[model samples]
Target chain A: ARAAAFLAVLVASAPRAAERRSVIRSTWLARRGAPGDVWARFAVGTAGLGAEERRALEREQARHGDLLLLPALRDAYENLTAKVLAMLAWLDEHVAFEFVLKADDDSFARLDALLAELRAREPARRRRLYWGFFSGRGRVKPGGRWREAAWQLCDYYLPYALGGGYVLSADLVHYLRLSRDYLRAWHSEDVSLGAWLAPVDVQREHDPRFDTEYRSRGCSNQYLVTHKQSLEDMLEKHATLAREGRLCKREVQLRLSYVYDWSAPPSQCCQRREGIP
Target chain B: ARAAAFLAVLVASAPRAAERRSVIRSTWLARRGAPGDVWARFAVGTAGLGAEERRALEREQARHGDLLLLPALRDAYENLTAKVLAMLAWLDEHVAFEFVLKADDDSFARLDALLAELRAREPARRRRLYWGFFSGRGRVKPGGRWREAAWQLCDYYLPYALGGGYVLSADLVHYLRLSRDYLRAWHSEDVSLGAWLAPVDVQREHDPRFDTEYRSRGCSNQYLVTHKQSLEDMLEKHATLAREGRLCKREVQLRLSYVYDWSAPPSQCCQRREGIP
Candidate 1:
């Protein structure tokens, strides 16, 4: 409905993660298409930082012009859901994009591959598509640091793409942005998105190529997105891609992965598959 | 769909206004019908109070059993919107009511008259009713303590009932309660209520008998509700009504009143009418 069309990549980053940002800048962000076709910006919250950290953040923002600094919320580990909502609010007000990618700083994405996957679908089909690695059998934490007492709508968390990285159509992004004030946030950003979007008729595309869960599903050459990566790992990944034209030397399986089963109850939905650990 | 149905009256009160609550308890609240038909509770926030004030509030709440102490928001003047929302949340979760009336601690209402007015409407018609003295011509304040910068939805706020006293049907109350997390709070609680309910197709009944604005219109025998009264004034009003079956000994006009003009722009919507000031 506005100007400047692009595939917007919103990277959720920590305020002081200068090295992580540098690695990302040199890695997948470097491989993104022309500036007019795709744009990437780091979403950082500036609350609870010291005066020195604030000054450094100011300097970094001035030099890079890629930071979406949010001042309304505390940049704490527990406030990740608030961070996600704040980013969505920013995009709703300032951007004109067809699709928006929500990524964590620790994740790396192959921009061209993801875009290719998106373009393969019809324009109307793309509007309803929610693309990522999704999980449906996650149990609700009754007690402890992850306790979700306000989630009385269901006994188990609804199916959601993992928070490490995921992509939402612009229409869905706008819906979340407008409903930000009314939708009660859950403890987890991914689960909150799933719960808020449960009523909508969204076409969820769960692909194994999205290694976007809590941990990496290993370094598969077919992976379009990888999560829980380190600065060195990202550099090595980018170096291998640039020099050898391959994501990894060989496939590295780090842990077992589970496919979300919708036919069964949540208690029986997630059974581990045979894989290297 | 809940048990223990009654007409609920929620009075927004300051934490330290013990005398105001006492006056309300002895006055119009006393005239409210049988214990099963109508109920009144003072909505008080306990935040920002001194230790002594907290102890006193504890004692008062313990003795009265009618204080809904909301600890989530401050009890200051600017947080009136939060106070109203908190009361609605409490009503949504705890009390089952056919209708909920929001009144200020400084206002007085004729319970029998208000109830009769409501009962006169068909049950189906009553479900979507929002009854009060509404003002559509209020201009948006750009600066000052009352400035509303986040109100980009319109030049003037959507028409809403004055906060001094207003009544909402249970369906509307539940709508507000469920939408609390998503509804952005405007500077004024009444204005915020209007903004949140703008998209809903509800019948807004603007009654002239509700002298519930910033200033009282006048003292009249037909006034169903009056605002901006002191404890002494409330007591005197109640005493006169109980002894002589009238609210005031003589009709008193304190200010001019204006009818909201829906056909005109906000700049021309309000023109003062001839009245004593």
Candidate 2:
């Protein structure tokens, strides 16, 4: 009965981020007899938690009934890939839907626009969709928190959509469900998804309107989804949309975004032009 | 005219290893009007070599006419993965056959037995073959000549047939050719192949007859192919075969071989049983 008729948006949230999840649920996720068939839930891994945190999570689950707690996956930063795989497997087993969106807890998505975009696709392309804002030329970091010591494959990672938010069709999700055992999970969940799907023939759709990188580009009303939002920012966007039916009051340009030049080599694919930033 | 009717066996050799190439050409690769439609060639990377070595390679190519010299790939130990990619690309462009076997120059293969085994396969299975002696679970060495700093995917490497020798159907080779630019290559050529083809739907056929690990499992007539063979071993095998019409005079196994258990985890997949070497 909880299954959506079309799309299910699953938010990746930490066990202690209850207030952030609350802001999202009371904002864009609040479906007030909306036209499109879309449902949202928070995915949290409960492994390795203290007794106090576990007890709080139990009360939250009973009261809200919106959390998908995975018992096997460790609730650690390094285990995000495993968490994503667990989410896909859980969706494959319990949920019946056409499309699934994996979003971070801080991501803000326009549910109506996303549902309309999904409906606009042709049936063939819709079935094999992997839609998001993609990066093809990011350099591989050797040190710092993002260092991937196990990545001897290349100087740069394979093309992957940003982890802040991304959408996959049921077929792709099912493939991940079937291959969870043998699939290798990189430290970063997004890069691991790209590596797993590198040989697959999925329909990859890159959209600029999905400003879903680690840093926010700007606040533009035309954007369908934007990530890296604070608690106040979510409430402000919801208030603006409810009062004036506009997502943002004015266009804000925090940084310049470049289009991906797919024909060039990886080094030049994402080269920033002069006077862009 | 140089293409085989069924299979092409490509040997990965160093540019300066002329004597090793000669031993292979005179031994099992001689093909004295052999019954099977099988052809063999030595693949050498001529890049980053001095003029003397390049000139010698040219003369050798002209004399034997069985060398595949790739100009782009550097013939270094770390570049074996790139060399394999170049070999597959060259095969895709020039060679036309059903299957191709990639073997090291130090490998000794029974051409007749390998060809017969390939022919016995059904057409459906023959089209998607990835056959060899496989290791489902091997520890990832963090430090040494075989260290992989970029292998954060798992503590153990994915399931891969050893690099000493392995066979791939034409379809798999073509896929590699098309995906060469995007596919990431690991430090080990065998592990790289397994990672790139991890999500593919290939029929992985593991046979114990392939003694193709880094170390040979001694001399056994039952083996279709054996690696780590010295120059003297090659000559001895050829002489014994020509004189007695048998691969070896007596069965000898210096080391023990264990069968891979597919149902076990990576840590336990290749566990040594009690009383077995």
Candidate 3:
């Protein structure tokens, strides 16, 4: 009896061991819910979202696991992300481990595959790294919002650019939080993150597996999670994938693809055919 | 000594008695920081307050007690008031209060005089009633935002309409909270308040002392807490009144003699003096 009680105490004390291991044990238990160990946070800035768009996004977030939606940052995208990162630090103190996934609400995220990829990567290496679809060698036209001195502060030109889909480890989050002096970038959140990461000798890794072109007809795979699928396309794809036993895989793939290439030109071959249905 | 012991016994046996009194004290305390409690909160929303105008109002609110300035509801006036009232209710729960004073942030109140008036009024008569500058009959024009809907909602033209300034007892607030459903007028908060009070048979007393035209120049007096003072005129008056003895009754009377004529055409009578230093 003494040994059994000691074992129970040990199990209870272990971080997230009880909840995560039991997530698949019973539907009833999962329905009751578990304290989330990891958090996927998205930051979207808009004047206002239409009713239909809001409802659709909310439903999708619900269908997925624990996620926090921070919207309407009042046109201050860079400041909003900094605030969110600060909030995440507060959240980290309470949880065993926490990761921040920042993306536009309009962009898609293949959370499951991303989680799998994260698990596959060396945990120690991931901790000090910032990962995202990075952009390099971009031009700014005069009189554009980015052309102003305030906007061009993060102006760094590089040859290899990752699309905007990036993940930052907890350590990097702390580093970025502490690196305020180095964070003089303009309004673009992705570029700001890239510029901030560069000085710290933090390098970007090109992951060809994460394609931003999932919306195009040629790449509709079951593994795609993140896609820039519109409300109509999301609904239609959700329905089609649900019937094919490819729901989970395709949804993630679609979302991931969209996250990386949501900004693809309409005239582009992939987007022209697979644009919002 | 027996009475004191009995009280001690009450305190000891009913431990919650202290808590209950605390709860009551808390309610009163909550009301102490009433919406009008902080001058700053009262200045956020004023009609036509430009950035410079807002800064001036903010400076004034800050200089005075940090008054609660309710931002002008603007297009969402009704919603804004509802929100403000809700905030007031939350505040009431945390403070001790026997009564609440509700007034537009723009409207002024001579707190000392108002408190004296409340002291003089019979408790029973004052407890269930709403009091303010009540105006029953006025020409309703189509131009103002509330005029058309307000006119149509009233079955008969009211002989006097209550101006924005009003005082309600705590019980009346509870009544309004409970009676919101039965009292549906167009969403004008002031008009809705009247509708709510009518069924409860709560009598509204018109106090000519509570002038809606407080800013209308001629009637201006520093002692007269509530007066309509335009932004431009307020700036000018602040400068003039800041002089020693300029805000005294005699000077106010002299200014009134020059400016007062309520029935005269507003434009012809109150034209800005172009050459005045």
Please provide, for model 1 over B1-277, each residue's C-alpha lDDT reduced to its tens digit, 9 standing for 90 to 100: 4434467899998887898898788889989876677877899888777799889989998898878888876887775887888888778888888888899988999998888887788876686678888776566555442221121333345567998899888877776665565556677899878666654446667666788888887787778888998888888889989999988888867666666444443334457676422
Interface RMSD of 3: 31.3
- Put down candidate 3 lDDT per residue, B75-114, tens digits, no spaces: 2343443443443443344334445555443334445455
Candidate 3 local distance difference test against the native: 0.37
| Candidates' RMSD to native | 21.1, 14.0, 23.0
Best candidate, lDDT: 2
List residue ranges in candidate 2 displaced over 4 A.
Answer: A1-164, A167-237, A240-277, B32-36, B143-151, B273-277
Candidates 1 onward: DockQ, in order:
0.02, 0.06, 0.01
The candidate, 2 or 3, that scores higher on DockQ is: 2
In model 2, pairs of residues that clash are A149-B149, A149-B150, A150-B150, A150-B151, A150-B152, A151-B150, A152-B150
Put down candidate 2 lDDT per residue, A1-277, tens digits, no spaces.
Answer: 6465588888999998999988888997884236448767899999888899889998998998889988877887655888888988899878888998889988898887888888898887695688887776556554342222122233356667898889999877877775555466566888878777754556667667777888998788877789999989889999988888878977787877766544444345555442332
Error of 1 at B67 (Å): 38
lDDT of 1 by residue, A87-106 (tens): 88778778888888899889
Provide the DockQ value for model 2.
0.06
State each model's CA lDDT, in order: 0.75, 0.76, 0.37
Positional deviation of A49 in candidate 2, in angstroms? Answer: 46
